[PDB]
Amino acid sequence: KKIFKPEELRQALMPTLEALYRQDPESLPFRQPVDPQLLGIPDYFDIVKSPMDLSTIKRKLDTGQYQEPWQYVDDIWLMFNNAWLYNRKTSRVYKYCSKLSEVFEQEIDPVMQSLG
Ligand SMILES: CCc1c(C(=O)NCc2cccc(Cl)c2)[nH]c(C)c1C(C)=O
């Protein structure tokens, strides 16, 4: 039941988020919230009830919204799962999502062993 200072959480986790955000071009579809009206996908919020993206996660990390590291990890998988759920497996975004998830696994694994 260890408690982490918000600042130490940000320090430990931010490099993993940076690694995802910097991944080009695979991060591009995940750098901002999905905007259904712009994209012409009006059923999006019927399928995805809990939208998530890298900018939102970044904000949560900056503003003390995570009490413990698994909450960050939860949001990352929420983001990936939303994309795997909504998009066809052949789609560009699905494929980018999978590649990003592999980057995430490599970066996160040592951090979370070293943390919680
Ligand atoms: C298909 C819509 C979508 C995007 C997206 O941003 N597309 C536009 C785009 C902009 C730049 C680069 C690319 Cl490749 C696509 N993003 C997500 C998570 C999704 C979904 C539904 O899951």
UniProtKB/Swiss-Prot annotation:
Q: Where is this protein localized, as stated in its record? A: Cytoplasm; Nucleus; Chromosome
Its PTM note reads:
Acetylated on Lys at up to 17 positions by intermolecular autocatalysis. Sumoylated; sumoylation in the transcriptional repression domain (CRD1) mediates transcriptional repression. Desumoylated by SENP3 through the removal of SUMO2 and SUMO3.
| Recorded superkingdom | Eukaryota
Q: Where is the Bromo domain?
A: 4-111
Q: What does this protein do?
A: Functions as a histone acetyltransferase and regulates transcription via chromatin remodeling. Acetylates all four core histones in nucleosomes. Histone acetylation gives an epigenetic tag for transcriptional activation. Mediates acetylation of histone H3 at 'Lys-122' (H3K122ac), a modification that localizes at the surface of the histone octamer and stimulates transcription, possibly by promoting nucleosome instability. Mediates acetylation of histone H3 at 'Lys-18' and 'Lys-27' (H3K18ac and H3K27ac, respectively). (Microbial infection) In case of HIV-1 infection, it is recruited by the viral protein Tat. Regulates Tat's transactivating activity and may help inducing chromatin remodeling of proviral genes. Binds to and may be involved in the transforming capacity of the adenovirus E1A protein.
* Free-text note regarding domains: The CRD1 domain (cell cycle regulatory domain 1) mediates transcriptional repression of a subset of p300 responsive genes; it can be de-repressed by CDKN1A/p21WAF1 at least at some promoters. It contains sumoylation and acetylation sites and the same lysine residues may be targeted for the respective modifications. It is proposed that deacetylation by SIRT1 allows sumoylation leading to suppressed activity.
Q: How does it assemble?
A: Interacts with HIF1A; the interaction is stimulated in response to hypoxia and inhibited by CITED2. Probably part of a complex with HIF1A and CREBBP. Interacts (via N-terminus) with TFAP2A (via N-terminus); the interaction requires CITED2. Interacts (via CH1 domain) with CITED2 (via C-terminus). Interacts with CITED1 (unphosphorylated form preferentially and via C-terminus). Interacts with ESR1; the interaction is estrogen-dependent and enhanced by CITED1. Interacts with HIPK2.
The record names the disease as: Defects in EP300 may play a role in epithelial cancer. Chromosomal aberrations involving EP300 may be a cause of acute myeloid leukemias. Translocation t(8;22)(p11;q13) with KAT6A.
- Record-given protein name: Histone acetyltransferase p300
Q: Which organism is it from?
A: Homo sapiens
Covered range within the whole protein? 1046 to 1161 of 2414
